[PDB]
Write a protein that binds this ligand. Structure first.
Ligand SMILES: NC(=O)c1ccc[n+]([C@@H]2O[C@H](COP(=O)([O-])OP(=O)(O)OC[C@H]3O[C@@H](n4cnc5c(N)ncnc54)[C@H](O)[C@@H]3O)[C@@H](O)[C@H]2O)c1
Ligand SMILES: NC(=O)c1ccc[n+]([C@@H]2O[C@H](COP(=O)([O-])OP(=O)(O)OC[C@H]3O[C@@H](n4cnc5c(N)ncnc54)[C@H](O)[C@@H]3O)[C@@H](O)[C@H]2O)c1
Ligand SMILES: NC(=O)c1ccc[n+]([C@@H]2O[C@H](COP(=O)([O-])OP(=O)(O)OC[C@H]3O[C@@H](n4cnc5c(N)ncnc54)[C@H](O)[C@@H]3O)[C@@H](O)[C@H]2O)c1
Ligand SMILES: NC(=O)c1ccc[n+]([C@@H]2O[C@H](COP(=O)([O-])OP(=O)(O)OC[C@H]3O[C@@H](n4cnc5c(N)ncnc54)[C@H](O)[C@@H]3O)[C@@H](O)[C@H]2O)c1
Ligand SMILES: Oc1cc(CCCc2ccccc2)ccc1Oc1ccc(Cl)cc1Cl
Ligand SMILES: Oc1cc(CCCc2ccccc2)ccc1Oc1ccc(Cl)cc1Cl
Ligand SMILES: Oc1cc(CCCc2ccccc2)ccc1Oc1ccc(Cl)cc1Cl
Ligand SMILES: Oc1cc(CCCc2ccccc2)ccc1Oc1ccc(Cl)cc1Cl
Lengths: 280, 277, 277, 280
């Protein structure tokens, strides 16, 4: 059992919570880390910062990974030469697939745990074409392409999950930049992918619609997350605090053979908030 | 020590059984609630060892008890004289929803898992337009309200962070000609009630409730459904009662503590398709 | 010459009226079906001119007839002796669903528009978990099965390409605490049945059926709903009974010939929101 | 009553059916026409080809329009110089808005009736990043931007509609190139837009999920439409043939004041096919 986790940058997000829970079932974890935060994440690892947070994880490997790039030929010269990518290799999608396959053979688990939008702070009406396409490229297409290259290094009857948010289905003002659009496309693509992957590969794919968690990404939005969290803890059917390991144990289930008959689905792990119409 | 009450088994050929089997792997103690008119037959078969092969898990299914259980009666007060006189029922007692909760609580204490696994529609063969008021309401009574009454009465005998599931079918959401008698209507109400119940039980007791929308299991038209499913579903493998079982087991465990009010599809992904390919 | 039967009016303060008004603009002849216990009061008020202002369209609403109509009885056969004896009912006749279809057909011939605009739940004040089996099934009987029985009996007296609508509410799909007694369950069943009925009626009679999910109209918690709606809905204007009326008119016309089996939201867009802003 | 129809190229699609139905209610129609097909469409108009099809429409104007371009500054040099754009002016989104406002003042109706995807023939898994982003840019973002520039030349209480397809919600193999993704994003964006447009502008926006129609675009897909049409006519609850004027009269209703309380909605005009699970 080996899982590649694409999109972890610290211990405060869903990626880490998923890693933690998979470790409990003795799953081998490989981190794919965005080069802008790659070095600091490494430094904190060896300097034992995450030691309190790993309570012990089985981290097979930690690789540079940028889901903007499908192959080495896609890397633009500027990025190629950038201070933070300098200096790094094999971080495209095709490249990490190959690298992982060489080091470890075929894997059976894949987690898409990333999203990005340059103009998330703008509302949809005010988002540029460029910002909107960026959101879809990094948050949605990246999943499709992740699948395309990893299906060849995955066995049957492997499993894939991604993370989404209810703003795709119902209006959440402030979730801007085309992020709502990107989540809607990703939830749709999850179905279409589940069809092709199931038929041709006997591989499963689902997505988890998570509730609010105060992560790096969540703060990128101009107190929105604080309100989100506070509103959820007040109005959700379940009033417990939502933890990243709550999503993690659900991710672990979806990735395991116990969920062998579930595919193409959007599964809500949000203390039930999604079921509410009117505040209390 | 976890205990699960499974309401609605009649043989080892349905979802209830598949759910019992998977739960047993987690060392969950099982209590069966069985429709009185087939209770004695079931006990006989069980005694005659007909289920021995079905019970093997190198682990035996630990069946704590098997009780007569009728989802159409809420309390002793609701038993009509015609069933009181009735052959089968005459030699059985304490089979109303409240009576069974009291029995279980008395004999074994509080439980923490509840499975609603039962449906009945006396006119399931007639299409909706030709279903009588009597047939429709019977369908709703047995298949939908029974869930609410189960929750009403079993919540008092459940631990906090307990979990509840029922079984539903996609005919509630999309048209399946042949799934008649108001069974579609009953499933739609059940999925809606699952949300409303999730709010109440969640806020007032910290108890979760979800429903599993299952693909076809041979437990006529069922042969069509199964064939069509196996031809057109994203996943080619045969859908097993234990495929639903392992999902049920997870929803009933604390691994799913943040999931409630949901309809979870366990159907090889058939629900996602629009047109045959 | 188009004729629409509107089942479920009691005053000029609800959706039924708003729908009658808008249809009148299209020169549709209106027949009202009125719950017997308020039939006489309604006739009196109508006679005493209490509705004259409400009827102005420089066009008068053309009310072809007003008949007693009870959605809980399918045929003369279903009338229980307690209602037979009953004060109000005693002096009225032919108010069962089949009886009214026969009357209308006899007096006026075939119609081509049908509106189901009625809901009743005797325990609407209790939350779902505390609703009795009796209260739940009453809700389903009056609010959901009544639609099926209406279609069953009125289809024989309708022209081809006729059209049918009912009224529903979003509590079926998302939790609205306070909308109790199984009204949420009833609405969920009604929206599902609308699809199943659309298939049967569409294939067998080329008749369409849809439902309108309406926002709140003051016709307690309703004051909350209306206030919340007017604060948080995408559209600020007040939701009028005639906002539902004009949508109903369109769904009942041939302009919507390719729309059937749908739940159409007329609620200022409130349904699309997740969190208050 | 003036309506701008963005995305008509002949009389065989939904745009024309919508034009026809709006004319019946005495609405003034302005066509926005993709420059690749602009000249031939004009030529056929004056050469009376469409005369049989206009049975008489009130065509206020016919303008070159390319929804790929938000402003003149967005036009790339090659396109600017292309044989078919040569030669044409004011065809960006900002430009047609301005032009229409100068000629006619403010309008009250807008129809987004276009879609495009370079790789529609490929299935999702095999779509490139570039193809996928093209689909979203032309089919989805174009609506957002159309709204952004037209809201200023529209009165309250104006109305906007677009066209979508059920492949966003359920799997339709063969609807490739990210078109499924684009429709899912567009249905989501319709909600988010309905919120901002309703609150700030008292303007409505909805989308029509249409059934199959043998149009130019529909044939671009590698007999798929023929099967679609044939399957729908066999299995839809309503077995009448679906006409472009069936959508048109629904479009007319949504655009009119009769639908003043409907917004953010996906309305199915498809003889009811969407409600079916199992074939007959
Ligand atoms: N936090 C929430 O409230 C919440 C709610 C619902 C869904 N989600 C989803 O969960 C997922 C994880 O987000 P999170 O909340 O854990 O924040 P996070 O910051 O912990 O995770 C996002 C990670 O993705 C990485 N990343 C961004 N762009 C990348 C690229 N081009 N290549 C590779 N890596 C890149 C970042 O380094 C970052 O660490 C996201 O898909 C998000 O949309 C989050
Ligand atoms: N089999 C399928 O293809 C399928 C698909 C979707 C959903 N389901 C659902 O799964 C659940 C279990 O059914 P199944 O398919 O396993 O068949 P099953 O026979 O195993 O389960 C139904 C059981 O309910 C019991 N029952 C009937 N009336 C009762 C009453 N008044 N009181 C108590 N119990 C009563 C019967 O004894 C029967 O054994 C049902 O709720 C059904 O709607 C089944
Ligand atoms: N008002 C709202 O906020 C709202 C919102 C969503 C849906 N609805 C729906 O609109 C429909 C009309 O209700 P309304 O809000 O206009 O109030 P209303 O009083 O105008 O309509 C309900 C009518 O149904 C009649 N009725 C009750 N029991 C009956 C029976 N057994 N037989 C025949 N008729 C009976 C009553 O006389 C009553 O006048 C209902 O179906 C309701 O569920 C209302
Ligand atoms: N035909 C169907 O079966 C069907 C079904 C559901 C939805 N739809 C939708 O209806 C809408 C109209 O499509 P149709 O089927 O009528 O085909 P169509 O070819 O008649 O309409 C598409 C038009 O959009 C124009 N267009 C394409 N790219 C453009 C750009 N960059 N700028 C401006 N114009 C551009 C084309 O010139 C073309 O005339 C589309 O959104 C389509 O997705 C069609
Ligand atoms: O996909 C999500 C969803 C949430 C929930 C936030 C809820 C909320 C409510 C109002 C305003 C903002 C956010 C938080 C973070 C998140 O991931 C995001 C969003 C945006 C970017 Cl650019 C990156 C990432 Cl990782
Ligand atoms: O809830 C379900 C769902 C299915 C799925 C297949 C049923 C089907 C499929 C196609 C056509 C007709 C019927 C099968 C059985 C089932 O349980 C049913 C249905 C009806 C009654 Cl009266 C009781 C039970 Cl336990
Ligand atoms: O079907 C509906 C829907 C609403 C919408 C508001 C109701 C509401 C909102 C918030 C809290 C509680 C109730 C109001 C009235 C209504 O009709 C009802 C409801 C209940 C019964 Cl017994 C009859 C009828 Cl005619
Ligand atoms: O949005 C749609 C939807 C349909 C319905 C086609 C149904 C179908 C089924 C199987 C395969 C292909 C198409 C047809 C055309 C259409 O518009 C499209 C689609 C793709 C492009 Cl590139 C352009 C346009 Cl205008």
């Amino acid at each position: 059992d080996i899982c590649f986790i694409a999109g972890i940058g610290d211990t405060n997000g869903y990626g880490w919570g998923i890693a933690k829970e998979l470790s409990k079932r003795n799953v081998k974890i490989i981190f794919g880390i965005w080069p802008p935060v790659y070095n600091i994440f490494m430094k904190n690892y060896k300097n034992g910062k995450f030691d309190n947070d790993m309570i012990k994880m089985n981290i097979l490997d930690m690789l540079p990974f940028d889901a903007s790039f499908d192959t080495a030929n896609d890397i633009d010269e500027e990025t190629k030469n950038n201070k933070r990518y300098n200096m790094l290799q094999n971080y495209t999608i095709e490249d990490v697939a190959n690298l992982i396959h060489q080091k470890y053979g075929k894997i059976n688990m894949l987690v898409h745990s990333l999203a990005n939008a340059k103009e998330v702070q703008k509302d949809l009406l005010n988002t540029s074409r460029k910002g909107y396409l960026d959101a879809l490229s990094k948050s949605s297409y990246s999943l499709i392409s992740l699948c395309k290259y990893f299906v060849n290094i995955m066995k049957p009857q492997s499993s894939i999950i991604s993370l989404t948010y209810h703003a795709s289905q119902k209006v959440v003002p402030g979730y801007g930049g085309g992020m709502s659009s990107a989540k809607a496309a990703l939830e749709s693509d999850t179905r279409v992918l589940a069809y092709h992957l199931g038929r041709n590969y006997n591989i499963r794919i689902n997505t988890i619609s998570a509730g609010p968690l105060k992560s790096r990404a969540a703060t990128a939005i101009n107190t929105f997350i604080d309100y989100a969290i506070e509103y959820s803890e007040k109005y959700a059917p379940l009033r417990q605090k939502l933890l990243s390991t709550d999503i993690g144990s659900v991710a672990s289930f979806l990735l395991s053979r116990e969920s062998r008959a579930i595919t193409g689905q959007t599964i809500y792990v949000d203390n039930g908030l999604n079921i509410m119409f009117l505040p209390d």
